[PDB]
Each structure stands twice: as C-alpha cells, then as structure tokens.
Amino acid sequence: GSTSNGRDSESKRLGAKRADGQFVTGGSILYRQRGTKIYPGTNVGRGGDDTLFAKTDGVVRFERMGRDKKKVSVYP
C-alpha cells in the first residue's frame, strides 16, 4: 500500500557548450562530461572533473582522432 521509490538527483547540465567554427575566448568551457568522452586536443586542457576548456583565443574545431575516439581543438 506504499512505494519505496521516488528519489532522483539534480541534473548536471552536461554536453557541449560551444559549437564548431565559433570564435572562443581563452579560459572558457567547451564540454562538460563524466570520464573522457572527448579527449583534449591542441590548446585544450581537461580539468579536475574532466571539463575541456580553452587555453588560448581561437576557433573551436571538433575533430576525429584514431578510429574510435574524438578530440576538440582550438586554432588561432
């Protein structure tokens, strides 16, 4: 006559935050994730909780590394 469920967390707003070809300011976030779905490429670093940010001003370019992986790069 009762239910033991009814609990859920708070959504973490994951996913991409900048688009391909868009000029981006240094220090800005590009992709929020758990683990490493996308690897940091050129001028991109991965933070403590695996958020890829940009080190220098440039243009975001999502691009394909070896057969089963992806990376994001920033080009001046």
Cβ of residue 6: shortest distance to other proteins, in angstroms?
10
Which of the listed partners (RNA, Mg ion, other proteins, none) does 42 bind, with a CB threshold of 5 to 8 Å by partner kind? Answer: none
Which of the listed partners (RNA, Mg ion, other proteins, none) does 32 bind, with a CB threshold of 5 to 8 Å by partner kind? Answer: RNA
What residues are paired with 63 via a beta bridge?
Answer: 71
Q: Known binder of ligand: residue 67?
A: yes
Q: Which DSSP string corresponds to 21-70?
A: T-EE-TT-EEEE-SS-SSEE-TTEEE-TTS-EEESSSEEEEEEE-STT-E
Determine, following the binding rule CB under 7 A, whether residue 48 of this chain makes contact with RNA: yes
